[PDB]
Symmetry: D2
Subunit: 302 residues, 4 copies
C-alpha cells in the first residue's frame, strides 16, 4: 500500500553510443535506486538510443538499427536480470519493430516490468507529435509520424506488484484524454518518459514556456484523476539539440514532490501512498457522484 | 479579431443586501470597465444574491426569493440598459427558477449578452458540487445538489459579436471534459464565475491548495484547447465563509495575463487576440492532425 | 492614490532600424495605453536602439552612435511632447554619453518623466552584468562592463506626482539590495526594463529557467518591500539572439497582476492602489517593528 | 562534496504531549532517514513542544516549562545518542532558557549537530514575528516578542562535517538579509524550521497566499545566494490552529527538488552536490565580480 517510486532521468545518448553503453548507464541508476530504497523506477521514452526522429532518413537499413526486434535482446537482458535480482520494477521506453508476414510495424513503445523481472504490460504511443515530412528550415526534424504508427493497445492500466499503473509516452501527457481514460480504469500511478526539445521551430514564441507546459500537463492530469505521476526525461544537449529536463514525480493533488536539477543521469525518488488517490477520487472527483458522461459525447465522436 | 476582455470580481454580498444594491455595485464595475476600453466583462456565479446554498432551508418561499423568474427583472434592467449604451457585453450568473410541465425547475445559470444588449445565449451548471442532504459534520453546508438540478443545455458555444464564446460555471472548470467539449466546438473565449470557499470540510488538508487548484484548472483548460479564458469570483468574507479571490484572465497558452489582488469589487482587463488560439490549434493541439477519438471511448460511456 | 500603470514591451529592434522608427513604435504603444485609461507607462532598457553590447566594437565612433548626448534630442522630442499633452508619465531607458572634467562617461540610464512632463529623476545602472573583454568561446558577446561604467547616483527614489517611484535596470532586479535600498526610502512603485537573453553561454544548464529567475526576482523584490513593480522587456529574436518576453506588473504581495504573451510591441495595464503597500509595510514587513539592522553589517562592507 | 539531505517535518504536537513522546516521534524519523540513506536531517522550529506563543501566559512557572534549561536534558539525550550512532547530523529547534546572575534570558533557538553527535553551532531567532501584548479579537495569539528576545549570535555559518551550513528560523526566511549575511560567509546549505499559521488575523486577505509566500521566500533566498536550502515545518491542526505544510528542500537555483504532501510526520530527501553552488556563485552572482556594497549603505543603518 506504501511504496517508493523513482525516476531515472538520462542525459544525452550520442548518435553512436552503443546499447551496451546505455544499459550500463541504466544499470547504475538501479544502484542509486536501492540506495534511496526504491520499489519501481521509471526510465525515459526511447531510452536505448539517441532521438533518431530528429533526422530525415533515406536508408531503411539505417533506420531499423534504432529499433528492437525483441525485448530484451542479449544486450538489454542484464537490465532485466538485475531487476529480478534486486527486486525493483521499471518502465522502459524503446523503439519496437515487428514483422507481420513481411510487413514491418513500427511503434514507439514502453513496457512495465515487475520486481520479478516479468513484462507485465505494454503501451504504444498514441499521440504522435511532429510533422509528416522533411522541412528544410528546421534545425532538427521531428519525424515521429513517419517512423512510428499510432499505437493499437489503447490506454491500458496494469497491476504491477502492489499497484495499478498506467503508461503515457511523451506528447501523450498533453492530452487530458490520456489521463481520463486511465483515471476511469483506476490507475493509481501514471508514468512514462519523454524527449522534449526546448526549441519548437514552427512556434518558437512558446520556447520559453517549455518547462511550464510540461509541468502544467503533469500537475493537471494527476490532480484531475487523483493519480500519482512520474515523468522520466532524456535531457540536455543531444546531438546539438537541447532537451528539456525537469523530470518529476507528482502527487494526486497536482503537487510536485520530486524534481531533477541536472541535465545528466539523475535519480529522484518519492514516497508513495496508493490510498492518497482517494482524497480526490472519493471526493471532489468522485466520478460516480459528479461526472456527467451523458453530456460528454462529442469527445468520443470520430 | 481583437478586443478588451474584463472580469468584474465581486466582494462579499450580505444576506440583507438588496438586489438593487448589488446591481448598483455592478453598474459601478461597468463604468470603470468603460474607462479602460473594455468590450466585454465577465461577472461572477450567482451574482445577485449571497451564496444561499450554504444554508439549509425549510421554508420554500424563503428559498425561492433567491431565484429569478425572469431575466432581466425590473431591478436588473438597469444593468442591461447601461451595458447597452456603453457597447459592453457581459457574462452574468444567477439562480433561475422555471416552471414547465408541473415541475419547478431550479438551475445555476449564466447568460451571454452581446454589445447591442441582446441576450445571445444561456448555460446551466452541469457539474453540481457539494451534497444533496444536510450534513452534521460540516462547518457550513454546500447544497447545490439540493437547490439545483444539472443543466439541460449541454456545453454550448455561441457567437458573441466577433467571437466564439463558451460558458462554464464554478466547479465545471475543474473537469477537463467541460473545456474539451467547447474546444471541439471552436470556442475562442471560455468564461464564467465562481464561489470557491478556502476551507473544504471533507478535505481540509487541501485548504492551502485552494488557489493552486483553481489556477491549475483554468490554465490547463486554456492550454489544452487553445482558448482564452476568464474566471470571475465572488470573494472575501461572506456570511462567515471566506471565498477565494484570484479572479483571472488566461491566454490560450495557459499564461495568466491578469489577476486580482483584492478581496473586494475589482475590475481586471487584458488585450485579447482571437487569432492567438491558432498558435496551439494549428500546431501542438491541431485536433485533426493529432487527436485520436477512437481510443477515447471510455470517457463517453455512462 | 489610485492610478492605472502600463508596461510598454518592445519586440526586437534591428541594427538598421532608426531612432525615429523606434520612437514611432513607442508613440503607438503610448496611444494604445491612453485608450485604456493609463496614467503612467514603463518602457524597456536601452529602448532607443538595438542591444549593441552584444557586439565587439573597434571603431569608437560607431560605438558612440548608439548613445544619446541629450534628452530628449530632436528625434525623441515627439515622445515627450505627446505624453506631456495626454498627461501620462513614463519610464524610458537609454544609453547615456556625458563628458565631464575631461572624461567621456558611458552609462546605462533610465529616467522618470511626470505627467506635466518634467524629467523628475534619473538612475544609472549600478550592477553591470557580463564581461569586459571580448570572449571567443561565447556565441554572442555581453559587453556592458566594457560599454558602460557603474552608475553614480545610488538607487534614488523620486516623488512622481502622487507616487514614490524608484528605478532599476535589468540585472539590478536580481539583487535583493537594489530592492531594499529603495524599500527603505518608501518606494511604492519600482520599475524598469531589461534585455534578457534566453541563452546564457557560461551556464546554459539554466536556460530553461530564464522566465523563472526573471519572475522570481520581481515577485520576491516586490513582496519583501511591499512595492508594486513593473518590468518592461525588449523581447523576441533580435539580431540572431532571442530575448525573454514576460513583461509584467507585480503587486506589493508579489502577485503577478499583468503579464505579456506576445514577443512583440505590447501594452499591458494594471490598477495600482498605493495604499496596498501598507498590507506588508504596516504589518509583516514593518521595518521599524521588525528589522534588525544591527546584524546586517556584512552586507555593507566593501 | 556530495551528501543526502532530509527534512523531517512534524505533524501537530498537543499542549500535553510530552517531550518523551515527541523525541520518540523524532527518533522514528531519524531512523527512516538512515533507511533512506540520509546524512543530515532538518527538524522544525521549537520542535520539542506544541507552539506555546499562541497563548497569553499569566503564570511564569507554567511558561518556563516549555523551555530547555540544558541541551540535551536526560529526555532529549536519546535523540543525540541515536543520531550519533547512526552517524546522522541534524538541526533541532527549541526554546532556550538561560540564567545569567538570576536574570532569565529567553531565546527561540536552533542548533546544528554533526555526525559524531557534537553540537557544532547555534543560532537564535533574530526576526521575531507577531505582537507584544494580548489582543482579544484574535482566535490565537502570536506572542513571540513577549516570550523571546531577538537573537544575539547574528547569522553565523558553521562547518558541519562536509558542509558550510547556516541556520534561519521561521520568519527569518522572509528577510533577504538573513540569506545575504550567510551567503557572504559562504553557506552551501541554509536550513531551518517554522510554525506558520495559514490564518493571519490582522491581514486575512493574504491567507490564501500562505504557501505562495513561504515558497517564494525560500526560492529567492536560495537563488540569490546560490545556496541549497531546507525548511522543516511543524504542520497541521495544532490546538485548534492550522499550521502550513509544504516543508521542502530547494536547490541553489531556487528549484524545489523535494516537497511534503501530508500534514503529519513526513521525511523527505534530496541529493545535494555542494558544488552546484558554483553555478550561481561564480557567474551571475559572482559577488566579487558584480556586487556593489559601496552603494548599499542604507541597508545597514540603525
Amino acid at each position: 500500500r506504501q511504496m517508493i517510486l523513482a525516476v531515472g532521468q538520462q542525459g544525452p545518448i550520442a548518435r553512436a553510443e552503443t546499447r551496451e553503453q546505455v544499459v550500463g548507464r541504466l544499470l547504475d541508476m538501479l544502484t542509486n535506486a536501492a540506495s534511496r530504497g526504491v520499489n519501481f523506477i521509471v526510465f525515459p521514452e526511447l531510452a536505448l538510443t539517441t532521438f533518431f526522429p530528429r533526422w530525415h532518413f533515406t536508408d531503411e537499413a539505417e533506420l531499423d538499427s534504432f529499433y528492437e526486434t525483441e525485448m530484451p535482446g542479449p544486450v538489454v537482458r542484464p537490465l532485466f536480470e538485475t531487476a529480478a535480482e534486486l527486486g525493483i520494477g521499471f518502465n522502459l521506453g524503446y523503439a519496437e519493430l515487428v514483422v507481420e508476414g513481411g510487413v514491418k510495424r513500427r511503434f514507439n513503445t514502453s513496457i512495465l516490468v515487475d520486481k520479478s523481472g516479468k513484462i507485465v504490460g505494454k503501451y504504444r504511443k498514441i499521440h504522435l507529435p511532429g510533422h509528416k515530412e522533411y522541412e528544410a528550415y528546421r534545425p532538427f526534424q521531428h519525424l515521429e509520424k513517419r517512423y512510428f504508427e499510432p499505437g493499437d493497445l489503447g490506454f491500458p492500466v496494469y497491476d504491477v506488484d502492489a499497484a495499478k499503473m498506467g503508461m503515457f509516452i511523451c506528447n501523450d501527457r498533453r492530452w487530458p484524454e490520456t489521463w481520463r481514460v486511465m483515471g476511469l480504469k483506476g490507475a493509481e500511478i501514471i508514468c512514462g518518459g519523454y524527449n522534449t526539445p526546448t526549441h519548437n521551430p514552427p512556434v518558437p514564441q512558446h520556447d520559453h514556456l517549455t518547462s511550464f507546459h510540461h509541468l502544467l500537463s503533469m500537475q493537471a492530469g494527476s490532480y484531475q484523476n487523483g493519480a500519482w505521476s512520474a515523468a522520466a526525461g532524456k535531457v540536455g544537449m543531444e546531438e546539438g539539440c537541447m532537451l528539456l529536463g525537469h523530470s518529476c514525480i507528482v502527487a494526486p493533488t497536482g503537487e510536485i514532490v520530486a524534481l531533477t536539477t541536472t541535465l545528466e543521469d539523475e535519480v529522484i525518488t518519492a514516497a508513495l501512498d496508493l490510498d492518497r488517490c482517494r482524497e480526490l477520487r472519493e471526493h471532489i472527483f468522485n466520478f460516480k457522484a459528479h461526472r456527467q458522461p451523458q453530456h460528454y459525447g462529442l469527445i468520443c465522436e470520430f
